[model samples]
Target: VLYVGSKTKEGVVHGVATVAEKTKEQVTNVGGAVVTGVTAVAQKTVEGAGSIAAATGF
Candidate 1:
């Protein structure tokens, strides 16, 4: 009985740990996507500014 309970506790702990790891990965994925989007927008803004300056001789 003691051995079985210990094994079960270990399994529960491992499951919790796996969940935490997956959550961390998901958060990282979301953060990367947001950064990519922001970077694209910034790049586009810079390009636009360059275009305007070229047209206006500024």
Candidate 2:
């Protein structure tokens, strides 16, 4: 299982490295090939979450 969390006070985001280092290394190698793509997706997730929260009248 993959778990991601961020520091509420400091605004630090991180994912837990539960899997083995070799597994992570393999995925990292593949991910590095599409750095820009991953960044865009992450940006969209943040923007979308912010928009939804604002629309909720919170």
Candidate 3:
């Protein structure tokens, strides 16, 4: 086979959103958002790092 193993949620995540535009802008507006949210918001947007920000009262 070309490759093997269970990539699971990691693989299901970035397929097209990797090149996202709206997502890119919303966070990038803050500048450091691109730097900070790179790992925090972008990926979590799919699930909820951007969501629970309200949880911690951001």
Candidate 3 displacement at residue 31 in angstroms:
21
Winner on TM-score (1 vs 3): 3
lDDT by residue (1-58, candidate 3, tens digit) is 3547755454333443356456443442442222444453234236533542333325
- Residue-level lDDT of model 1, residues 1-58, one tens digit each, is 3464453332121222222333232335322222221111222223334331123322
Q: For model 1, where is the 10-residue window of minimal lDDT?
A: 36-45
TM-score for each of the candidates = 0.11, 0.17, 0.16
Ordered by lDDT, highest first, the candidates read 3, 2, 1
Tell me each candidate's RMSD, in Å, in order.
21.4, 14.7, 9.5
Positional deviation of residue 15's Cα in model 2 after best superposition, in angstroms: 5.5
Would you list the C-alpha lDDT of every candidate in the order shown?
0.27, 0.34, 0.40
Supply the global lDDT for candidate 2.
Answer: 0.34
How do all the candidates rank in terms of TM-score, highest first? 2, 3, 1
lDDT of 2 by residue, 1-58 (tens): 3448843433444663454434232334322232221221223235434431123322
